[PDB]
């Protein structure tokens with residue numbers, strides 16, 4: 001859920 | 011126009 | 022208890038009480054609906070609303086209501102449910118007939134959640150009441166009355182929650198909060214039924230086919 | 237109101253606060269899923285969670301969290317919503333576009349009610365905070381840890397509700413009895429987006445597109 005993840009990481 | 015339920019709401 | 026009495030709602034609860042699993046769960050529903058109307062009669066001020074407004078409210082909540090009835094009746098059984106019909110439907114049985122997804126949702130979402138808090142029949146008859154007085158129901162001639170009457174059923178339930186269960190402050194909120202899930206499950210419960218009829222594989226008896234037949 | 241406070245639950249609300257319309261809404265809707273994440277980073281303890289959980293919670297609650305955020309926005313607008321993209325969208329624009337049925341439902345069922353009780357930004361964040369913390373969500377690693385957080389939130393609200401509007405006893409339950417609608421609206425609301433994807437003539441962006449993806 002590539003985008004969601006990317007936003008949550010940083 | 012849904013008979014049985016109206017019939018059941020008289021008694 | 023001045024205008025909405027906790028007991029009386031609870032009276033109605035006590036008062037109404039009892040190969041192809043799917044076929045069975047249906048035989049049970051048409052049978053349950055008959056008894057449901059009477060339950061409804063038994064709730065303070067329901068019958069004081071014009072029949073038409075009553076029929077929209079009953080048509081509006083037949084799934085949510087009978088659902089939470091059978092959920093509570095099932096706080097006893099391990100994995101499965103007990104029908105009004107007196108059969109048991111186990112999780113394996115339901116899964117084998119293609120309806121497991123919903124089945125676990127009832128069991129996870131409602132039955133364990135209910136069972137965990139040891140919800141009483143009063144608290145059940147009370148929630149069922151807030152369902153029935155859904156002022157958001159379509160075609161409802163006086164929305165003001167139904168709306169307040171829910172304001173009654175709930176000021177009444179909160180008060181009771183404090184009395185019987187003062188140790189747990191958050192009881193009131195937790196109970197209201199299974200209502201969205203109740204909503205969610207009922208709608209998904211409806212779909213399945215349209216599909217059974219659409220197929221015509223599953224015999225559906227008259228009262229049911231009625232509540233599936235459009236306005 | 238120390239572990240989980242309204243005061244911040246307000247900050248996390250102040251900080252994110254902002255040609256065929258079924259497109260204008262959907263864009264607005266994509267743009268929003270981004271800021272939604274910034275909000276969830278500020279509703280306390282969401283982050284502390286396993287990131288695997290922050291994903292499940294958000295995929296399952298984006299529909300309702302978003303609908304609720306706009307409806308609040310649109311208290312001023314008479315008969316239409318206030319989208320984050322700046323445009324104002326009237327009910328007829330909606331009707332002419334084949335979506336008269338659900339748009340009316342958001343207005344009647346959610347906005348009018350918001351306006352009628354003059355529901356505040358804190359009250360909203362809290363209702364959103366509750367929505368975010370759904371224990372029923374499948375695949376949640378510690379569904380109880382969530383169950384907890386909704387429980388702290390919904391307490392901090394009552395403390396508010398009881399405080400700030402002391403003349404208003406039924407407010408807390410009133411506030412929470414809009415959620416089953418929120419859910420109800422969200423399901424059908426969702427039902428379309430899949431349709432607009434299926435028939436293929438409505439533009440749908442990357443983020444919005446990710447959410448309409450099979451778990």
Ligand SMILES: C=C1C(=O)O[C@H]2C[C@@H](C)[C@@H]3C=CC(=O)[C@@]3(C)[C@@H](OC(C)=O)[C@H]12
Nearest residue numbers: 043046050084088120123127210213214
């Ligand atoms: C909840 C129900 C209800 O009120 O009526 C029945 C409707 C049938 C069609 C429905 C479809 C799939 C299902 O499993 C069941 C059989 C039931 O769900 C449960 C609990 O079994 C469902």
Ligand SMILES: C=C1C(=O)O[C@H]2C[C@@H](C)[C@@H]3C=CC(=O)[C@@]3(C)[C@@H](OC(C)=O)[C@H]12
Nearest residue numbers: 261262265302303335338339425428429
């Ligand atoms: C609230 C929405 C959101 O966040 O996403 C969009 C999703 C679609 C599917 C939904 C269905 C018809 C619609 O018009 C909209 C676009 C919006 O709803 C309304 C009626 O405002 C809805």
